[PDB]
């Protein structure tokens, strides 16, 4: 026995499960994957899952929750609208599952195709047993069509049995032909039953009229009966009455063939709920129940007497349901127990997205609400959370996981924290995708935390412009103010205020970033000096920054640098700027005696900070004395 | 929307990318001049107006232009030189950092068709049937697929890393991989015949299997990579050849496409694999368009009549 | 398919990173090999060089908050940390530069066998357990300096020398806790409200809960990530052919000057392998757990409905 170590990695690559062995002459690394139904690395399966999620959440909005309404008030249409929305969602999910199965059937797959077919059959059975008569219980045609579709999608029997039971063999009066005709007439396939009876049949006397009437009744069967008027019910009962009359006339005449024609007439008429003709010419329980419902009453109040016949039929059903994983689920759903099929649908025989969609549909159709169970919320929410937690790998995109986790409750804040803890690098596409996925719901704190983490990670590399947009947007304004103060302190050095050179100058994020135009104006005035316009713009920016806006550390340095460009010891000229400069100098000196400047040519000869203010005041006085007397 | 004259035939228009966690729309956009004796690749920066920030001369017609990052922009010349222009965000000066003159050549000079942008690689294609896969700070290419097809490529879209899908001049879409052996494609999806010629190819942002392409007849074909070998939906639009076609990265329902007739239609399906509303942003009079960019609310495009339409309010 | 790790001796641990195309390996031949996955899924060797003088047993990689760092613990009483450099060639024994070394510590002066880093929410911290019975806690105060690794705490979990196993809590919305296993004991240390007193060398021992029901030595121990759940999950791999799984639910509202009592509850105990377990990993969100024994099979357990452990697969 060798010590086998299987490191199941999931934090980086979930489709790369490495396994090793701590033994001699065993230095081989074997990379493997997960289950065949939990991985699904194909693009078609991912697209089908995304479409199903968008149809179950994005297309439901308010119809995804169980909303109870009063039936004896003015809001009686709310329940009908909810039922219609649930039926539409179930139909969309069934169509998506059928499309996924048809796409996977052409990709050389056997087990996956069988699992998809079983999931589709289970969904069809659930829709026929639940969302089919909730809004309108008079729709017999739709229920019959759903039952026929479910019986066709269940088992493939019979497919090639017609070519083997009736293959140029004289004659067609044996029990095999009768069994093949009964199996075709029990599943609602009237065309196949009419085609098999017109191939080889001894048309004798007496019973010829009865056989023609039976064929005519089978070809022109009713499949439409509304409850709004009694005419439809009368027309539907007339066919059964005519069939019973024809069967009685065939049984009470000279028809000696009572071992096949009489059985067919009894199965086609109302002689099927007594367990004599329907239970004897059947191979399964669902087919026999469908035949009994099509022959006798077609209501859902007599399903208990049809799903449970005798001991032999129950044993046959139990033996046939041990191979496939859909017959047991259908039998559990038909007996008012749809909660037991979730454990069978959430296995390796039906993947997990289909099971989650079925659970969500059952929870929205007022069939599996809170109670509660053991998770704290419900079964559908727990299944959605489990699917969102499992749908996380290296090749799979994070958008699908973020969309699946937003509709549930778990795998949200912890998942966002785990994703942000390993994303502090030079990657803006992932951050943009996370910000776009977090802004699709009511989670404004996660996006702000992600933006703050991105700004803190970008500030460590000293990348100006890129980090300012992340610190000013979705990060309040303290970080943006600190970045602006740092930029203003770094730009105030020598005469040429460059600082942000090379390729690091950006800032565009709403009014939170457009309000910091003082630094841009100062940079434009320092890089481009256009007569007195640049000086006026710099003076205006300094006056705006010194008015309790852009901090107060670099404001004194900016004022000292601006005062040295006008007049160091002579006169100058300033239009509507000298008064503002004098006011700023008087307000800065009466605060708490705190300033500071740089050093260049004339500033290096001083020592304190009031020298710049005194020089500015002297220059303003000289300008107002030898420039403000210019009268026109 | 507003137009601006530049006295240059713009052949490409790609907006600059935003930072990580931006709030506003795009303000800067690059352009590429062609069909002249002195092509230049300037970059503008925003009735609306826009001023030129930097300018750099480019040898040959810029057949394709894409921004690899916030300061790097890859361009495909007409002589087979895939140069990476390093734009300065502060000094406003476009410089040439890395270039590959031996990316597309005939052994003559083969013109480079399309060029993908994915950090940190460089996927491009030319008329000689060579699918090179360069990277950043690399002299030689990491992988070069020398296709022996009789047709010539026009566009190349990248679905998953690192398997891209190119379109030839016969209406066929071949999917190749950089880590695969040989020079043959894994899948081949064509249309009806070999008379139609695809010129644009772009995939969806959410679906890695769905991709839209445009032939030489103006019909927008939306095919899949796992649904046979034909198109799932073929709907006509314009009458001339389809120039460029790309969808939005924020919403996958809205998608814009440019043709050679002078109409910038913006389809709005708010699925492409299944009543789509089409609205032309530009009218007649103007000549044909070359490319069109879309970054959320901003929309920039270039025409052949020395015009550049810009609109920062597409949904407002 | 399977591939060779290019190791002369037997492999000990094989941890992965946090991206998806990186895997570290350490054997008993004093070598630290790093694997890199390509676009086709094939694993290729990136860098392989010597890091210590003894036999490496513990190997774990840090998160991306402080760069591409990787820790390694050998039997030579040393715990050095390597840093990946992008300015070096692949497979050149020079891309992983040594930052610091934990060899002069009093708590890590014996044969180290367990070394795992902490989460990114508490900084660049890591834990190590040697044969001396004292668990060393190293944490870097400066994020820019990768060589300034100071000793944060030094608690004594055991006293003798046996199999050590370190496992920290990956829950970001919970308190700072870490599980340490030694011989048949499996305690769980948790940080109190006296961080300033513990960081100033004044706190002796600190224990919150302990995982019992172990009649043999624990070979591996890992804590599952509590993604959405209010309780913790920690799987144990003992040598008594029993895979226990603890369940602690005690993290509530931290009152001003109050206290809490950590409770332990056995969830399930699997014994289908009928052999001594060696590895026991979990999922990224706490939805799947694996257990490998001496029978040559890896069973993947998953959570049912009533907090039950059910084997959903068995790979060999």
From Swiss-Prot, chain A:
It is found in: Nucleus, Nuclear pore complex; Chromosome, Centromere, Kinetochore; Cytoplasm, Cytoskeleton, Spindle; Cytoplasm. The modification Phosphoserine is found at residue 204. GO terms for molecular function: structural constituent of nuclear pore. It holds the Pfam family Nucleopor_Nup85. Keywords: Acetylation, Centromere, Chromosome, Cytoplasm, Cytoskeleton, Disease variant, Kinetochore, Membrane, mRNA transport, Nuclear pore complex, Nucleus, Phosphoprotein, Protein transport, Translocation, Transport. The modification N6-acetyllysine is found at residue 73. It comes from the Eukaryota. GO terms for biological process: lamellipodium assembly; macrophage chemotaxis; mRNA export from nucleus; nephron development; nucleocytoplasmic transport; positive regulation of DNA-templated transcription; protein import into nucleus. One of its GO terms (cellular component) is nuclear envelope. Changing residue 562 to P: In NPHS17; decreased function in nephrogenesis; unable to fully rescue morpholino-induced nephrogenesis defects in Xenopus; decreased interaction with NUP160. Disulfide bonds: none annotated. Its main location: nucleus. Belongs to the nucleoporin Nup85 family. It is linked to Nephrotic syndrome 17: A form of nephrotic syndrome, a renal disease clinically characterized by severe proteinuria, resulting in complications such as hypoalbuminemia, hyperlipidemia and edema. Kidney biopsies show non-specific histologic changes such as focal segmental glomerulosclerosis and diffuse mesangial proliferation. Some affected individuals have an inherited steroid-resistant form that progresses to end-stage renal failure. NPHS17 is an autosomal recessive, steroid-resistant progressive form with onset in the first decade of life. Component of the nuclear pore complex (NPC). Component of the NPC Nup107-160 subcomplex, consisting of at least NUP107, NUP98/Nup96, NUP160, NUP133, NUP85, NUP37, NUP43 and SEC13. Interacts with NUP160, NUP133 and SEC13. Interacts with NUP37, NUP107 and NUP43. Interacts with CCR2. It comes from Homo sapiens. The gene is NUP85.
Swiss-Prot record, chain B:
It is found in: Chromosome, Centromere, Kinetochore; Nucleus, Nuclear pore complex. WD repeats lie at residues 5-46, 57-95, 108-144, 148-186, 193-233, 237-270. PROSITE patterns: WD_REPEATS_1 (PS00678), WD_REPEATS_2 (PS50082), WD_REPEATS_REGION (PS50294). Keywords: Acetylation, Cell cycle, Cell division, Centromere, Chromosome, Chromosome partition, Kinetochore, Mitosis, mRNA transport, Nuclear pore complex, Nucleus, Protein transport, Repeat, Translocation, Transport, WD repeat. The keyword Cell division applies. One of its GO terms (biological process) is protein transport. One of its GO terms (cellular component) is nuclear pore outer ring. Component of the Nup107-160 subcomplex of the nuclear pore complex (NPC). The Nup107-160 subcomplex includes NUP160, NUP133, NUP107, NUP98, NUP85, NUP43, NUP37, SEH1 and SEC13. Component of the Nup107-160 subcomplex of the nuclear pore complex (NPC). The Nup107-160 subcomplex is required for the assembly of a functional NPC. The Nup107-160 subcomplex is also required for normal kinetochore microtubule attachment, mitotic progression and chromosome segregation. This is Nucleoporin Nup43. It comes from Homo sapiens (Human).
Curated annotation (Swiss-Prot), chain C:
It comes from the Eukaryota. Signal peptide: none annotated. The gene is SEH1L. InterPro entries: G-protein_beta_WD-40_rep (IPR020472), Sec13/Seh1_fam (IPR037363), WD40/YVTN_repeat-like_dom_sf (IPR015943), WD40_repeat_dom_sf (IPR036322), WD40_rpt (IPR001680). The modification Phosphoserine is found at residues 175, 186. WD repeats lie at residues 6-45, 51-92, 107-148, 156-206, 213-254, 272-311. This is Nucleoporin SEH1. One of its GO terms (biological process) is nucleocytoplasmic transport. Keywords: Cell cycle, Cell division, Centromere, Chromosome, Chromosome partition, Isopeptide bond, Kinetochore, Lysosome, Membrane, Mitosis, mRNA transport, Nuclear pore complex, Nucleus, Phosphoprotein, Protein transport, Repeat, Translocation, Transport, Ubl conjugation, WD repeat. Component of the Nup107-160 subcomplex of the nuclear pore complex (NPC). The Nup107-160 subcomplex is required for the assembly of a functional NPC. The Nup107-160 subcomplex is also required for normal kinetochore microtubule attachment, mitotic progression and chromosome segregation. This subunit plays a role in recruitment of the Nup107-160 subcomplex to the kinetochore. GO terms for cellular component: cytosol; GATOR2 complex; kinetochore; lysosomal membrane; nuclear envelope; nuclear pore; nuclear pore outer ring; Seh1-associated complex. Pfam families: WD40. Belongs to the WD repeat SEC13 family. GO terms for molecular function: structural molecule activity. It comes from Homo sapiens. The keyword Phosphoprotein applies. There is a cross-link at residue 8 (Glycyl lysine isopeptide (Lys-Gly) (interchain with G-Cter in SUMO2)). It is found in: Chromosome, Centromere, Kinetochore; Nucleus, Nuclear pore complex; Lysosome membrane. The GATOR2 complex is negatively regulated by the upstream amino acid sensors CASTOR1 and SESN2, which sequester the GATOR2 complex in absence of amino acids. In the presence of abundant amino acids, GATOR2 is released from CASTOR1 and SESN2 and activated.
């Amino acid at each position: 026995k060798n010590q086998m170590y299987f490191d199941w990695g999931p934090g980086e690559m979930l489709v790369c499960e490495t396994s090793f062995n701590k033994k001699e002459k065993s230095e081989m690394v074997p990379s493997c994957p997960f289950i065949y139904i939990i991985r699904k690395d194909v693009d078609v399966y991912s697209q089908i899952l995304r479409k199903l999620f968008n149809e179950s959440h994005g297309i439901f909005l308010g119809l995804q929750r169980i909303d109870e309404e009063l039936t004896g008030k003015s809001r009686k249409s709310q329940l009908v609208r909810v039922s219609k929305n649930y039926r539409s969602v179930i139909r969309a999910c069934m169509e998506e599952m059928h499309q996924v199965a048809i796409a996977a059937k052409d990709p050389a797959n056997g087990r996956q195709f069988s699992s998809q077919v079983s999931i589709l059959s289970a969904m069809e059975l659930i829709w026929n047993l639940c969302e089919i008569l909730f809004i309108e219980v008079a729709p017999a045609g739709p229920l019959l069509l759903h039952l026929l579709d479910w019986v066709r999608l269940h088992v493939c029997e019979v497919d090639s049995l017609s070519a083997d039971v009736l293959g140029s063999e004289n004659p067609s009066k044996h029990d095999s032909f009768w069994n093949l005709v009964t199996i075709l007439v029990l599943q609602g396939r009237l065309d196949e039953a009419r085609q098999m009876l017109s191939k080889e049949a001894d048309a004798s006397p007496a019973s010829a009229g009865i056989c023609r009437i039976m064929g005519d009744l089978m070809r022109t069967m009713p499949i439409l009966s509304p409850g709004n008027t009694q005419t439809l019910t009368e027309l539907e009962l007339k066919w059964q009455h005519w069939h019973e009359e024809c069967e009685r006339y065939l049984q009470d005449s000279t028809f000696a063939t009572s071992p096949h024609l009489e059985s067919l007439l009894k199965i086609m008429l109302g002689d099927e709920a007594a367990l004599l003709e329907q239970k004897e010419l059947l191979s399964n329980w669902y087919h026999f129940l469908v035949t009994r419902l099509l022959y006798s009453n077609p209501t859902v109040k007599p399903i208990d007497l049809h799903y449970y016949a005798q001991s032999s039929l129950d044993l046959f059903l139990g033996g046939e349901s041990s191979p496939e994983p859909l017959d047991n689920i259908l039998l559990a759903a038909f007996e008012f127990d749809i909660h037991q099929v979730i454990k069978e649908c959430s296995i390796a025989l039906s993947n997990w997205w289909f099971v989650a969609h079925l659970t969500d549909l059952l929870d929205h159709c007022k069939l599996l609400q809170s109670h509660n169970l053991y998770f704290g919320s419900n079964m559908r929410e727990f299944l959605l959370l489990e699917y969102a937690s499992g749908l996380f790998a290296h090749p799979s995109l994070w958008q699908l996981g973020v969309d699946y986790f937003d509709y549930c409750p778990e795998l949200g804040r912890v998942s966002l924290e785990l994703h942000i803890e390993r994303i502090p690098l030079n990657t803006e596409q992932k951050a943009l995708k996370v910000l776009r996925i977090c802004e699709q719901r009511q989670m404004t704190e996660q996006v702000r935390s992600i933006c703050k983490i991105l700004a803190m990670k970008a500030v460590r590399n000293n990348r100006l412009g890129s980090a300012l947009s992340w610190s000013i947007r979705a990060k309040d304004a303290a970080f943006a103010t600190l970045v602006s103060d740092r930029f203003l302190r770094d730009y105030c050095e020598r005469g040429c205020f460059s600082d942000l050179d090379l390729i690091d100058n950006l800032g565009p994020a709403m009014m939170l970033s457009d309000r910091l135009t003082f630094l841009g104006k100062y940079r434009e005035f320092h890089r481009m000096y256009g007569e007195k316009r640049f000086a006026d713009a710099a003076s205006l920016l300094l006056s705006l920054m010194t008015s309790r806006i852009a901090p107060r550390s670099f404001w004194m340095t900016l004022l000292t640098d601006a005062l040295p460009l006008l007049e160091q010891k002579q006169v100058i000229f300033s239009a509507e700027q000298t008064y503002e400069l004098m006011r700023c100098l008087e307000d800065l000196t009466s605060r708490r005696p705190v300033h500071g400047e740089s050093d260049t040519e004339q500033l290096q000869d001083d020592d304190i900070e009031t020298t710049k203010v005194e020089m500015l005041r002297l220059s303003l006085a000289r300008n107002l004395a030898r420039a403000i007397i210019r009268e026109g | 929307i507003y137009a601006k004259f530049v006295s240059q035939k713009i052949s490409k228009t790609r907006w600059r990318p935003l930072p990580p966690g931006s709030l506003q729309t795009a303000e800067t956009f690059a352009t590429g001049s062609w069909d002249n004796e002195e092509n230049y690749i300037s970059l503008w920066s925003i009735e609306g107006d826009h001023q030129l920030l930097c300018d750099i001369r480019h040898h040959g017609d810029v057949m394709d232009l894409q921004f690899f990052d916030q300061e790097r922009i890859v361009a495909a010349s007409s002589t087979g030189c895939v140069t990476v222009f390093l734009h300065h965000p502060n000094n406003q000066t476009l410089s040439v950092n890395q270039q590959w003159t031996t990316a597309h050549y005939h052994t003559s000079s083969a013109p480079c068709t399309g060029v993908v942008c994915n950090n940190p690689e460089i996927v491009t294609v030319g008329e000689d049937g060579r699918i090179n896969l360069f990277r950043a700070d690399h002299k030689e290419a990491v992988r070069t697929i020398d296709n022996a097809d009789s047709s010539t490529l026009h566009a190349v879209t990248f679905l998953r890393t690192p398997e891209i899908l190119t379109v030839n001049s016969i209406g066929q879409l071949k999917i190749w991989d950089f880590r695969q052996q040989g020079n043959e494609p894994s899948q081949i999806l064509s249309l009806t015949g070999d008379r139609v010629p695809l010129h644009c190819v772009d995939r969806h942002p959410n679906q890695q299997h769905v991709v839209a392409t445009g032939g030489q007849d103006g019909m927008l074909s939306i095919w899949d990579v796992r649904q046979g070998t034909m198109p799932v939906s073929l709907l006509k639009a314009h009458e001339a050849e389809m120039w460029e076609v790309h969808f939005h990265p924020s919403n996958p329902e809205h998608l814009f496409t440019c043709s050679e007739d002078g109409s910038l239609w913006h389809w709005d399906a708010s699925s492409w694999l299944s009543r789509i509303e089409i609205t032309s942003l530009l009218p007649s009079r103007s000549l044909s368009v070359n490319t069109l960019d879309v970054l959320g609310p901003c929309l920039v495009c270039g025409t052949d009549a020395e015009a550049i339409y810009v609109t920062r309010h597409l949904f407002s | 398919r399977s591939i060779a790790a290019d190791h002369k001796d037997l492999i000990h641990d094989v941890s992965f990173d946090f991206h998806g195309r990186r895997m570290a390996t350490c054997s008993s031949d004093q070598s630290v090999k790093v694997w890199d996955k390509s676009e086709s899924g094939d694993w290729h060797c990136t860098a392989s060089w010597k890091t210590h003088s003894g036999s490496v047993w513990r190997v774990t990689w840090a998160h991306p908050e402080f760069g591409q760092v990787l820790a390694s613990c050998s039997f030579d009483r040393t715990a050095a940390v390597w840093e990946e450099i992008v300015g070096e060639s692949n497979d050149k024994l020079r891309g992983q530069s040594h930052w610091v070394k934990r060899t002069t510590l009093v708590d890590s002066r014996t044969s180290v066998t367990d070394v795992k880093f902490a989460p990114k929410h508490m900084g660049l911290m890591l834990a190590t357990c040697s044969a001396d019975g004292i668990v060393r806690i190293y944490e870097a105060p400066d994020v820019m300096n990768l060589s300034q690794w100071s000793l944060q705490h030094e608690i004594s979990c055991k006293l003798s020398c046996s199999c050590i196993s370190w496992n920290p809590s990956s829950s970001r919305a919970h308190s700072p806790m870490i599980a340490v296993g030694s011989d048949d004991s499996s305690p769980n240390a948790m940080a109190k409200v006296q961080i300033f007193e513990y960081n100033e060398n004044t706190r002796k021992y600190a224990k919150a809960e302990t995982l019992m029901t172990v009649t043999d030595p624990v070979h591996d121990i890992a804590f599952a990530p509590n993604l959405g759940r209010s309780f913790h999950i920690l799987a144990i791999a003992t040598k008594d052919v029993r895979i226990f799984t603890l369940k602690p639910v005690r993290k509530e509202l931290t009152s001003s000057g109050g206290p809490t009592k950590f409770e332990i509850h056995i969830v399930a105990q699997f014994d289908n392998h009928n052999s001594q377990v060696w590895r026991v990993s979990w999922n990224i969100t706490g939805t799947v757990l694996a257990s490998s024994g001496d029978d040559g099979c890896v069973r993947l357990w998953k959570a049912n409905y009533m907090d039950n452990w059910k084997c959903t697969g068995i790979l060999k």
